[PDB]
Design an enzyme around this catalytic site. Structure first.
Site, short mmCIF file in Angstrom:
data_model
loop_
_atom_site.label_atom_id
_atom_site.label_comp_id
_atom_site.label_asym_id
_atom_site.label_seq_id
_atom_site.Cartn_x
_atom_site.Cartn_y
_atom_site.Cartn_z
N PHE C 84 -1.92 -1.73 -4.93
CA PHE C 84 -2.10 -0.31 -4.67
C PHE C 84 -1.67 0.05 -3.26
CE2 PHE C 84 -6.03 -2.54 -3.71
CZ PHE C 84 -6.28 -2.15 -2.40
N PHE C 86 -1.11 0.04 -0.18
CA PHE C 86 -1.32 -0.75 1.05
C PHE C 86 -2.39 -1.83 0.95
CE2 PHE C 86 1.61 2.34 1.73
CZ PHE C 86 1.13 3.62 2.02
#
Ligand code: HAS
Ligand code: HEM
Ligand code: CUA
Ligand SMILES: [Cu+2]
Ligand SMILES: [Xe]
Ligand SMILES: [Xe]
Ligand SMILES: [Xe]
Ligand SMILES: [Xe]
Lengths: 33, 557, 166
Positions: C84, C86
């Site tokens: 997701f 970062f």
């Protein structure tokens, strides 16, 4: 005049360069398998 | 309203110049970010300085979009459009439809401007691959669409020239450059469909607000339909020059017309149906099809392998006529004082490592070693940023004068050689730096100078990246200085603007005829090429279109 | 001279072409070899496995991070990873070495890369699709996951951790 000694010398370098790259990375592929 | 009888007689000259100028302008602007990107991959963060100079710059990534767009897309296309229309025109001594030719320039210009605005305003920080869900401003997608479509006009213009010539020479084989140009543009047409489809079906309605979702897999599958062949779209114009102009500059001849035709024919056939080599690491694409594309990709290497020998033999031939000595004497006999010779020859040197990189990438399973790492940028700067660009740069020495009547002083000529050597040298150093760091798992498309301690094992290759950045910064500066010095002088010898293009003579044989004749069955080969595309993409695309799963767009900058 | 050089070049050209093709076919044989071995696991699953990216961390195998790892065979462990904006879920992923770890990775937002430093695991992660790769760790430690596909401003800082179990 005769046999393309310089041109054959070029495509020799190319062939060897291809082989170092391919076999060099073919080795690493199995080292990380 | 036209001030020089040279342009009234050869109006295509003018249109060509505008393509070129616009092309190099985009090259300069895009390349400015290069040195900073290199330093970045040398672990040094110079961006504050850049930000102070170019305030509109908001991030590393906006600068990388501009770099990829202005250099790989804009510069290359314009150059192509210039070369692959003008050369066949001059070879045939026929005038291209000028209404259309100017139309194509305006499309490219308007399209460029329209797309430039949202890029410059940070409305389109998605990179030159613009993968969804990453959502840019509509004017980016519209601008690009128009700019690319400009090529469709170019295709028409060349086909037109080709039909007209075949009418005035019934039963005569297509002349060499024209042949190349023809197979070239046809190839591009078939290649462009992938992108067109993506833009027309998803991208454009998406950015205009008609739809809210776009399936990422299908979008990138269509992209790479065009994605790979486009690099050949970048390459072949240089090839054209290398086959038909370089031998002359070297003081020799093209040793084989049929070999050159064959090479180009193979490209028409094998350029498009290989896009899965850019998708090895993708899910939802059958592993068998990947292998198939992997094989077709090793086949598309064949044309280049031929080129290597044909060109090398022609250069060896040229060197011998100049008083070539032994195994390596011919090399020293060449005109190393002439940039138009030197530039492309250097490009070809670095192309050897470049191509070996490609073949590696092409080997399915072996891609998993290097995919998305700094190795890939390493690969392509040897290909596009080196060979194509140098060729383009070096061709300025015969081309610019041929278009403008402006001579090139001995000072500029030597300034050119310096730029050439530095660019090449700089490119070589960077190639080593990025390949090395790529094997050390450093990712590409990364502002890694913002996370200094993330890649300690890439200590020494980081140094090479710093060096290159400097080297190339100097070369770029010298190019700008040298380029403008030429475009900003008022010395005008109108006689050299009327001199013919330095096309090389071609050595022909007995067996040529029947092989050349076969290759000249363009309509047949085109359909053949078309069939391969449907065979390699059809099966997969069908299954993807039956199971579309569009997702919503994102802005993450 | 010139017409003598024509026949010599075109003859060594045919020999070059035959050799090149032969070298390429050897590569094709050495790639066909790697497809029959255990190393070929890292090849993404070919069949389509659609998922909703907007409900993936609400309902389903990716909803609860605690149920990420799940023994599905005698020596097989299916890990449900989520790449997701970062980061990676679960962080860290914990698996036993010597066991066949079947990753099933997806994303809730944009495309991500799943690169396990030291291994052949290198797969693109697509929103609305499951990336399914098989791998057997043979060495113990903390393997770092790197996101190698540009995913936004925090992309350079998107890392993960797999701790194979001594
Ligand atoms: C214009 C520049 C482009 C060329 C040309 C090019 C050639 C190849 N490529 Fe590539 N490429 C790949 C495979 C190949 C193969 C098999 C070839 C072949 O066409 C290369 C054939 C070349 C040769 C077989 C060498 C012949 C040598 C010659 C011709 C020089 C001889 C020198 C002489 C004669 C001079 C001697 C002179 C004297 C004085 C002695 C693959 C994998 O299959 C990837 C995906 C990697 C990944 O995972 O993302 C890829 C990725 C890219 C990307 C990244 C796109 C992105 O952003 O995602 C770009 C821009 C690019 C451009 C280019 N690429 N490529
Ligand atoms: C001034 C000389 C140049 C330097 C120092 C340079 C340097 C670099 C570096 C370090 C990268 C890696 C960026 C990253 O992975 O984050 C890069 C990417 C790239 N370069 Fe250049 N480059 C130069 C000129 C060119 C030219 C002439 C072209 C094409 C004609 C070009 C096309 C590209 C493209 C398409 C990318 C990838 C963009 C992306 O991944 O979004 N560059 N360059
Ligand atoms: Cu996920 Cu970069
Ligand atoms: Cu490609
Ligand atoms: Xe587009
Ligand atoms: Xe553009
Ligand atoms: Xe397009
Ligand atoms: Xe591209």
């Amino acid at each position: 005049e005769e046999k393309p000694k310089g041109a054959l010398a070029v495509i020799l370098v190319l062939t060897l360069t291809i082989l170092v790259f391919w076999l060099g990375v073919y080795a690493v592929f199995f080292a990380r398998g | 309203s036209e001030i020089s009888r040279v342009y009234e007689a050869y109006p295509e000259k003018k249109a060509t110049l505008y393509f070129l100028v616009l092309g190099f302008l985009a090259l300069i602007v895009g390349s400015l970010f290069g040195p900073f990107q290199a330093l970045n991959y040398g672990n040094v963060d110079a961006y504050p300085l850049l930000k102070r100079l170019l305030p509109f710059v908001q991030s590393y990534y906006q600068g990388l979009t501009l770099h990829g767009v202005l250099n790989a897309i804009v510069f290359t296309q314009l150059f192509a459009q210039a070369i692959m229309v003008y050369l066949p025109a001059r070879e045939l001594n026929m005038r291209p439809n000028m209404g259309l030719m100017w139309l194509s320039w305006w499309m490219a210009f308007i399209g460029l401007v329209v797309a430039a605005l949202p890029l410059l305003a940070n409305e389109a920080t998605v990179l030159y691959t613009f993968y969804p869900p990453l959502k840019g401003h509509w004017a980016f997608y519209l601008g690009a669409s128009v700019f690319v479509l400009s090529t469709w006009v170019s295709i028409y213009i060349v086909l037109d020239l080709w039909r007209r010539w075949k009418a005035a020479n019934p039963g005569k084989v297509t002349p060499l450059v024209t042949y190349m140009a023809v197979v070239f543009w046809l190839m591009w047409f078939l290649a462009s469909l992938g992108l067109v489809l993506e833009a027309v079906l998803f991208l454009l309605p998406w950015s205009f607000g008609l739809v809210e979702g776009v399936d990422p897999l299908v979008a990138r599958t269509l992209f790479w339909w065009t994605g790979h062949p486009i690099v050949y779209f970048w390459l072949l114009p240089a090839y054209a020059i290398i086959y038909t102009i370089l031998p002359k500059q070297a003081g020799g001849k093209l040793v084989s017309d049929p070999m050159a035709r064959l090479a180009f024919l193979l490209f028409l056939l094998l350029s498009t149906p290989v896009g899965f080599h850019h998708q090895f690491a993708d899910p939802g694409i059958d592993p068998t099809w990947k292998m198939i594309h992997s094989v077709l990709t090793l086949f598309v290497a064949v044309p280049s392998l031929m080129t290597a020998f044909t060109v090398a033999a022609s250069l060896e031939f040229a060197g011998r006529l100049r008083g070539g000595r032994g195994l390596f004497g011919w090399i020293r006999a060449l005109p190393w004082d002439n940039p138009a010779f030197v530039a492309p020859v250097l490009g070809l040197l670095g192309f050897i490592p470049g191509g070996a990189g490609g073949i590696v990438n092409a080997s399915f399973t072996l891609d998993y070693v290097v995919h998305n790492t700094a190795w890939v940028p390493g690969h392509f700067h040897l290909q596009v940023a080196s060979l194509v660009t140098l060729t383009a740069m070096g061709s300025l020495y015969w081309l610019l004068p041929n278009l403008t009547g402006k001579p090139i002083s001995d000072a500029q000529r030597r300034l050119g050689l310096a730029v050439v050597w530095l660019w090449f040298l700089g490119m070589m150093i960077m190639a080593v730096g990025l390949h090395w760091a790529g094997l050390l798992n450093v990712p590409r498309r990364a502002y890694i100078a913002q996370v200094p301690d993330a890649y300690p094992h890439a200590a020494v290759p980081m140094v090479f990246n710093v060096l290159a950045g400097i080297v190339l910064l100097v070369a770029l500066l010298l190019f700008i200085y040298g380029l403008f010095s030429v475009l900003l002088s008022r010395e005008r010898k109108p006689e050299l603007a009327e001199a013919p293009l330095p096309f090389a003579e071609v050595i022909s044989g007995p067996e040529d005829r029947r092989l050349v004749l076969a290759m000249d069955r363009i309509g047949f080969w085109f359909a053949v090429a078309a069939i391969l595309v449907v065979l390699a993409y059809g099966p997969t695309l069908v299954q993807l279109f039956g199971h579309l799963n569009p997702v919503p767009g994102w802005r993450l900058w | 001279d010139e017409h003598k050089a024509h026949k010599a070049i075109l003859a060594y050209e045919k020999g070059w072409l035959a050799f090149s093709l032969a070298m390429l076919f050897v590569f094709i044989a050495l790639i066909a070899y790697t497809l029959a071995t255990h190393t070929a696991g890292v090849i993404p699953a070919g069949k389509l496995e659609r998922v909703d990216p907007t409900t993936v961390r609400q309902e389903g195998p990716w909803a609860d991070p605690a149920q990420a790892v799940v023994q599905t065979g005698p020596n097989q462990y299916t890990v449900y990873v989520l790449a997701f904006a970062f980061g990676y879920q679960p962080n860290p992923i914990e698996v036993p070495q010597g066991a066949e770890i079947v990753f099933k990775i997806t994303s809730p937002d944009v495309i991500h890369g799943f690169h396990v430093e030291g291994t052949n695991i290198n797969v693109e992660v697509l929103p609305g699709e499951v990336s399914t790769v098989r791998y057997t760790f043979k060495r113990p430690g903390e393997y770092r996951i790197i996101c190698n596909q540009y995913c936004g401003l925090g992309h350079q800082n998107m890392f993960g951790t797999i701790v194979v179990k001594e």
